[PDB]
Amino acid sequence: PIVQNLQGQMVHQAISPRTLNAWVKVVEEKAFSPEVIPMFSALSEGATPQDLNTMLNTVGGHQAAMQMLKETINEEAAEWDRLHPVHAGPIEPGQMREPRGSDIAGTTSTLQEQIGWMTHNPPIPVGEIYKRWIILGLNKIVRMYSPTSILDIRQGPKEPFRDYVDRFYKTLRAEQASQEVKNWMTETLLVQNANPDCKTILKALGPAATLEEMMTACQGVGGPGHKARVL
Amino acid sequence: PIVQNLQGQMVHQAISPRTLNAWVKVVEEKAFSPEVIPMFSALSEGATPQDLNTMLNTVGGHQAAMQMLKETINEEAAEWDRLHPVHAGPIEPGQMREPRGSDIAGTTSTLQEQIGWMTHNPPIPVGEIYKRWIILGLNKIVRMYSPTSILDIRQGPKEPFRDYVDRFYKTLRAEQASQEVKNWMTETLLVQNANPDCKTILKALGPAATLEEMMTACQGVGGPGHKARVL
Amino acid sequence: PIVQNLQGQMVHQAISPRTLNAWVKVVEEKAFSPEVIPMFSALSEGATPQDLNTMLNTVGGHQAAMQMLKETINEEAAEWDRLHPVHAGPIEPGQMREPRGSDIAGTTSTLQEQIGWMTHNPPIPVGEIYKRWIILGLNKIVRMYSPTSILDIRQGPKEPFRDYVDRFYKTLRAEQASQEVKNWMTETLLVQNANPDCKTILKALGPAATLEEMMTACQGVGGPGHKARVL
Amino acid sequence: PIVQNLQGQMVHQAISPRTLNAWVKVVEEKAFSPEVIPMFSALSEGATPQDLNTMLNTVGGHQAAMQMLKETINEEAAEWDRLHPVHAGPIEPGQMREPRGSDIAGTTSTLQEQIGWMTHNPPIPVGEIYKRWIILGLNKIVRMYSPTSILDIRQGPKEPFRDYVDRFYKTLRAEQASQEVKNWMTETLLVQNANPDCKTILKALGPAATLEEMMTACQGVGGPGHKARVL
Amino acid sequence: PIVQNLQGQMVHQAISPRTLNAWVKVVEEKAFSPEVIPMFSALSEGATPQDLNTMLNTVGGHQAAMQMLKETINEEAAEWDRLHPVHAGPIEPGQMREPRGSDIAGTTSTLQEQIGWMTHNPPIPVGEIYKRWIILGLNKIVRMYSPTSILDIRQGPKEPFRDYVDRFYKTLRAEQASQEVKNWMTETLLVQNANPDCKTILKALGPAATLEEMMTACQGVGGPGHKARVL
């Protein structure tokens, strides 16, 4: 990634094994979970295409998803080719050539030419384009190895209301659908699969208008709320 | 290692005992498996010929593999002797001698004579060549200690397609043959040594179809498929 | 047949005795085969009616086929006489007469007259009209002798697909079907009159399998007599 | 077929019968095997599309394979048609008719209408493109006679090496492996799937070997006699 | 192939299907036999490298031997490449580009290049250069079928002299043998192991006598072979 940004934002240092082991511990245990996306992003803000490749090829497990990520990136580098009819040398004497999808993806480009674009004035941000495409793929794998299953879950007769709404709101985050389809998940699907004693409170006070009332309401079904596993 | 933080300037910083502790603990655990090869390249980025030796000899185990690398680096040292002369014209202050394959190996040279070639204008690539001879040399270990006959690969009787292709790539990564051969293993042996019902769906789909189509297919063969347990 | 030039000077010669010696080998071998229908065409290029009659007369055996043909062609002469518009007569100097079913046979036309119509720009293409009449009867010959039944054809229980699939397309080579129906026969009935063990695999491969995978199906169920030996 | 004459005019030579009798015999004897392929190509030179139909459709046996070729030509005529649109650009007195996919196939174009593209400048190459879709079709059919697994086949215990070597190279000729691959099968698989007593010498002699040296290897399996075993 | 004078206003036309058809009929009837190679030597005069490889390709059988010919060919071309290094390359009024051994083998030349060398002055006859290497490929096979054992081919007193003629001249000519080797071989394998009543006869003649006086020797000799001599 680039280092010493207050001094100049031009001088580099290779990806840290500490950084890679925290990615490799995510990629085992949390790769399929929505939280992958901001942790990856925070880790790889300021990175080179070389850095973005090196995190994924460091991974020893989940080799189909690493392949799924490789597919998404070619599918996107293929779109850059149909989007941009780019030429080989400089179209303007005195300036850089334009990057292609392969130069963006890190196949046809040295660390020097990658940071040549980012450091050139004005910059051309060849890893800010790359990291987007790994986020398309992280969204694609979050679906592929781990779909929502929101019909399947429900509140059982001795099961707590708060913990069931904690699951549903995680499931609804992981969901990639439009807003109106998810709005029905909250105002009908939740109300339908809740226990009937929690159902009265759901239908009275509106889940599209309050939730704090219903964290205090409905504490018989799953039993007293201070004896709960999460505390 | 060399570190840089200001443009045009090189400066050394000493190898850490904690950098070495991490190294020798992932060699104890995983040996020289592909998850270590771009972690080592990231560990040894700036590393001198003095420091590389320092990583090579701090390892206590896996000595047959280490010895197969000692044979490999000095074969390459032998080859640098073959294609370049020995430096033996007389030297003076303000005159550097040109490296032998052993000066590149660090096995007849002091830190000052090394960091001199390396911080030079324009620099001599004395740290990058030795690193290369270990990265080739680990690929050389990996290919022998690779346990799995890719020719004799077969799907589990209750196994899902999704774990089968994931196992398939993971195994194929350490096999020796050039990538055109890997590509045909992937077409051939994955369609043929899947479980019988699947092997027909891949024939209907096609051997040359896109990896999403192949990853999606064959679910519920061998009993129900399954997904990551983070919702 | 005539002699081609670019001089318009189109001289005539009698049919080659060799062209007939090749044909009277072909009539004995291949006379009710699908092979004889463009193979007649291949030897009768530039034919006058007298060359088309001469091929007919030079056959000694298979008189029941040459007779059923000659019937068919006389029906087409008679068809063309009902098509013909009666009594146009010599109402233009510089204008050839309109041809009847007898002129196209060669029955009320002399050889010189015949080459006239042909060598005219645009032609009146009498010999080709006759040839199409003959090919049209030769199709009717193959239709009436050769296996053409789609409900009689079937595959036995330990019978290769390789030999079946071949004599299926040889059945429908000879048969007439409109395109829409010929799609339906190849799709529907070829799979359906297959044996239970092949047929499940052919349900499996379906219309989704490409014809290189489809029409080589069933080799591990048909055993060593259904696989190829390698010569 | 056609000969070029008098400053770009072409004039027909109708086929020789002794050509036509050979051509149908080679298919009747060897089917669609490797050898027919350069011989069809030679039949295909100096001929318009309509002749190539007369030569191809004369095949009366082998009709499943001929469906697999025919449906290749059907498919390739669609690719070519949707590639170049007929009559949608600039047009004027004296221009000739522009060719569809149907016209290259010789379905919707006439004999001297096929020559009309051929005698134009720049000239259009209707024969060679048609000839091209047939040759690609005939490279599919050779693999119908070749083994479905080339890893699982092996030489029997008392079986000749000379047959074995024959069989492997004739296999590589059907399959049409990539260049990295092919070089790796003559080195690895041929060695591994020889019989264990043919193995011991072929490992020892190795794969730099010259073919006579290699063919005079493994005569020990035959045992002692007056005959040598390479014959 | 090429028609008219090679050192003249040479012309090149498209290949007869007959020439490939005829050759491979001979090969399938008679294989690599002494009557055969002189037919191939007669065809080659006026055939281009592309034509010469199209004949070699048109042979479908006999493939361990056809490989040994392609290997022997490349071994002549490798030696030729090294012997005859390239001089200067493309010359604008000069040679279009100059051949190397793989060009003359057809391997890296297209037909317009093969025709441009022969239509240069001095003409380079690449099929005449090619022809001799190919005949060495034909010959290389037959020396394989020939016994190499001098112990086994030895004369003895029981069997007639005519019958040692095939065995002798088969092994002797299995490679290039000089006069010095042959007189060693005629004494040691033949004339020293004759019948004792023939030995003094053949000893006054000596090893470099003619074969017709060795064959007609032993006039007035009784014993084995005396009813089986020509005189």
From TrEMBL, chains A, B, C, D, E:
Q: Write out the GO biological process terms.
A: viral budding via host ESCRT complex; viral translational frameshifting
Q: Tell me the GO molecular function terms.
A: identical protein binding; RNA binding; structural molecule activity; zinc ion binding
Tell me the keywords, alphabetical order: Capsid protein, Host cell membrane, Host cytoplasm, Host endosome, Host membrane, Host nucleus, Host-virus interaction, Lipoprotein, Membrane, Metal-binding, Myristate, Phosphoprotein, Repeat, RNA-binding, Viral budding, Viral budding via the host ESCRT complexes, Viral nucleoprotein, Viral release from host cell, Virion, Zinc, Zinc-finger
Q: Where can this protein be found? A: Host cell membrane; Host endosome, Host multivesicular body; Virion membrane; Virion
Q: Name one GO cellular component term.
A: viral nucleocapsid
Cysteine pairs bridged by disulfides in the record: C198-C218
Its main localization is host cell
Q: Say yes or no: keyword RNA-binding present.
A: yes
What is the annotated role of this protein in its UniProt record? Answer: Encapsulates and protects viral dimeric unspliced genomic RNA (gRNA). Binds these RNAs through its zinc fingers. Acts as a nucleic acid chaperone which is involved in rearangement of nucleic acid secondary structure during gRNA retrotranscription. Also facilitates template switch leading to recombination. As part of the polyprotein, participates in gRNA dimerization, packaging, tRNA incorporation and virion assembly. Targets the polyprotein to the plasma membrane via a multipartite membrane-binding signal, that includes its myristoylated N-terminus. Matrix protein is part of the pre-integration complex. Implicated in the release from host cell mediated by Vpu. Binds to RNA.
State the family it belongs to.
Belongs to the primate lentivirus group gag polyprotein family.
Assembly and interaction partners: Interacts with host NUP98. Homotrimer; further assembles as hexamers of trimers. Interacts with gp41 (via C-terminus). Interacts with host CALM1; this interaction induces a conformational change in the Matrix protein, triggering exposure of the myristate group. Interacts with host AP3D1; this interaction allows the polyprotein trafficking to multivesicular bodies during virus assembly. Part of the pre-integration complex (PIC) which is composed of viral genome, matrix protein, Vpr and integrase.
In Swiss-Prot or TrEMBL terms, this protein is called Gag polyprotein
Native organism: Human immunodeficiency virus type 1 group M subtype B (isolate NY5)
Q: Which gene encodes it?
A: gag
Full protein: residues contained: 133 to 363 of 500
